[PDB]
Amino acid sequence: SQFYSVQVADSTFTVLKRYQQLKPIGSGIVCAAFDTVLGINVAVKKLSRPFQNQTHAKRAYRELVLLKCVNHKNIISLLNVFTPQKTLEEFQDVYLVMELMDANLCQVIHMELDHERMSYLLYQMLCGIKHLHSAGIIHRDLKPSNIVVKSDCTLKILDFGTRYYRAPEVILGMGYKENVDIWSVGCIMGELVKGSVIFQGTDHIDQWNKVIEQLGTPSAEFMAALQPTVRNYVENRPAYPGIAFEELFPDWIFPSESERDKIKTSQARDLLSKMLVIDPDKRISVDEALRHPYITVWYDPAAPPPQIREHAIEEWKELIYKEVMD
């Protein structure tokens, strides 16, 4: 096969000749490109020095294996993968070709969405997350910027797993389970409705303060699950009663141009109140969220789980190279 090179935004992209007129859409570094075999625009991602250490190679091998095996309507589709190198010995760069979307969620936060659209977006998020959970993948890094949409309101998750969306248990260095991703969904949901970040901490420790001021000091039952030294910190914070959810998310920030909006507003606030819960023992699960009145309107009763670690940098390199070549 033949390639050509183009300097794009401080970088040099060397790609198959089928991908033309590259233009940057984010930062792996990502370009939009016209595919002259398919006749469509695609997204071309050049992986950022994939084998510089232990972390990078581990991450990039995972991303590539998962993109190839996972097929769900709410997870980004891989269209092609290539390298401009011809041997394992000179092998340096990996290019991922993915479907091109219209926008990420940061951009939709700035608009005035009705209940139908908000609930449909949230339904899709939870569907994507459920599929990831069923494959043993707990994401932990969900945020507006790694979720993309089409103008017909289709939603896909970009990666397989920033401070503003981290669950209380992550902040306090506890363990976590599936519903760690529900906290993040609650944070994104709140922001879609409010137009601003719910918990905007100046640092990772100030994050806890932002949570406490709004939701209140968590229960003694929750405290019991902390190691004494971590609990000492938590209990030495000023005490907060928490703000009522009717006050946190007042009627006026919700759509209110018809009478049927009134009940959807009660439902949306109720779901928020179950997702934004400090104690993961008491926080809603993905399956229950999917059955919530606000969400379940989108469920159709009429997808197979995917057919799915420490190494030397050279051992990782041959693993990645094998994945690119088949």
Ligand X SMILES: O=C(Nc1cccc(-c2n[nH]c3ccc(-c4nc[nH]n4)cc23)c1)c1ccco1
Positions touching a copy of itself (CB under 8 A) are 263, 266-267, 269-270, 291, 293, 296-302
Decide which of a copy of itself, ligand X, none touches 224; Cβ closer than 5 to 8 Å per partner kind. Answer: none
Decide which of a copy of itself, ligand X, none touches 76; Cβ closer than 5 to 8 Å per partner kind. Answer: ligand X
Decide which of ligand X, a copy of itself, none touches 149; Cβ closer than 5 to 8 Å per partner kind. Answer: none
Q: Examine residue 111 and tell whether it contacts ligand X (CB under 6 A).
A: no
Which residue type, as a one-letter code, is found at position 108?
V
d(CA 312, CA 61): 13
> Which residues are 16's β-sheet partners?
3
| Number of chain positions touching ligand X (CB under 6 A) | 16
**Smallest separation, CB 211 to a copy of itself (Å):** 23
CB 253 within 8 A of CB 241: no
Tell me whether residue 63 or residue 178 sits nearer to ligand X (CB atom).
Answer: 63
Q: Any residues with CB less than 8 A from the CB of 49 and at least 6 apart, and which?
A: 56
d(CA 139, CA 154): 20
In the numeric block, which tokens belong to residue 322?
Answer: 């094998």
Which DSSP category does 149 fall into? E
141 annotated active-site: yes
In the numeric block, which tokens belong to residue 254?
Answer: 């919700």
Which DSSP category does 310 fall into? -
**Smallest separation, CB 43 to ligand X (Å):** 4
Q: Examine residue 64 and tell whether it contacts ligand X (CB under 6 A).
A: no
Which residue type, as a one-letter code, is found at position 182?
I
Decide which of a copy of itself, ligand X, none touches 98; Cβ closer than 5 to 8 Å per partner kind. Answer: ligand X
Name the site residues for ligand X (rule: CB under 6 A): 25-26, 28, 30, 43, 45, 76, 98-104, 148, 158
- Residues acting as catalytic residues: 141
